[PDB]
Amino acid sequence: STGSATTTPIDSLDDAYITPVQIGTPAQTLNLDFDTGSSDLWVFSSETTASEVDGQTIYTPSKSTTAKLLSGATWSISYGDGSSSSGDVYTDTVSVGGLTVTGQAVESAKKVSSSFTEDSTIDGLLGLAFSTLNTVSPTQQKTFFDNAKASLDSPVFTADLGYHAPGTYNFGFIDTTAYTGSITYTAVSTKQGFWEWTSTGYAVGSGTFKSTSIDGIADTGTTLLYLPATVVSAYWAQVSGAKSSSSVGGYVFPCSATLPSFTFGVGSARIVIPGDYIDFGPISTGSSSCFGGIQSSAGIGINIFGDVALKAAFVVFNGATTPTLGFASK
């Protein structure tokens, strides 16, 4: 089997991407944020505290003939940005892009933090990291990808995110029309439950490539590119008037600037992030200070190749017995 679904930016900055997901019988379609940095499939629901719902579409298990309470199971998650959610668990039929899993754990939110409530466009998350990070207790649950894997034509999914445009998530096949040149594969460590890999270095603009190992994770659920403070200072030093602002919470730059590209290494291959991908616009409406898309990881504890970096590539998440990542230009 295979599946193929379009993923659409939630706003003009590509802050996140939503993908429609069918849950239950008859289908209830919710727009979920596919997150390769977490392992829970959770939704706004008929159980979510009413004051914490503001425009999201909700899953109502009582209206699904295939929903079953997973008795005694609870979940609770905290993300890198400080946001959180928790609740109980149903099993139900879940379909993405024509690919169906029966008996998928659907984690129903009873509580969500303010950042979720305030984002009316995101109806929940579909985690695509390794199932060792799933938060369901006392019986940990499998991701949608781990449940689908054995049925897929190939045990892979691909992320093809757009720059200010829709893109695609494919399951079970590699669309050879979706990229240019060849795919370069690189080793993955699953020790922390992430798609963790090691980049071979970087360049700023037309500068020379610096060969250096940068361990990090491929995370579709993170907007920006977070890298060591040495690398980030080297990038922003090439932009007149850029500075790190403790009041704003990272590097800002004059909105009149033209940003340089950023290149990262994947083995002997190179992925080039155009400068425009690094512009996240005014820090507040009408400001002439703009927020940067490359930021220091120093206060996180991990480097994160988020959407700024991934949208520059066709990315293969290979879930074979020895997992690997693949990157191609496009």
UniProtKB/Swiss-Prot annotation:
One of its GO terms (molecular function) is aspartic-type endopeptidase activity. The active site is at residues 35, 199. Its EC number is 3.4.23.22. It comes from the Eukaryota. Residues 17-328 form the Peptidase A1 domain. Disulfide bonds join 255-290. The keyword Hydrolase applies. It catalyses: Hydrolysis of proteins with specificity similar to that of pepsin A, prefers hydrophobic residues at P1 and P1', but does not cleave 14-Ala-|-Leu-15 in the B chain of insulin or Z-Glu-Tyr. Clots milk. GO terms for biological process: proteolysis. It is an enzyme of class 3 (hydrolase). Keywords: Aspartyl protease, Disulfide bond, Hydrolase, Protease, Signal, Zymogen. Belongs to the peptidase A1 family. This is Endothiapepsin. The gene is EAPA. The chain holds residues 90 to 419 of 419 of the full protein.
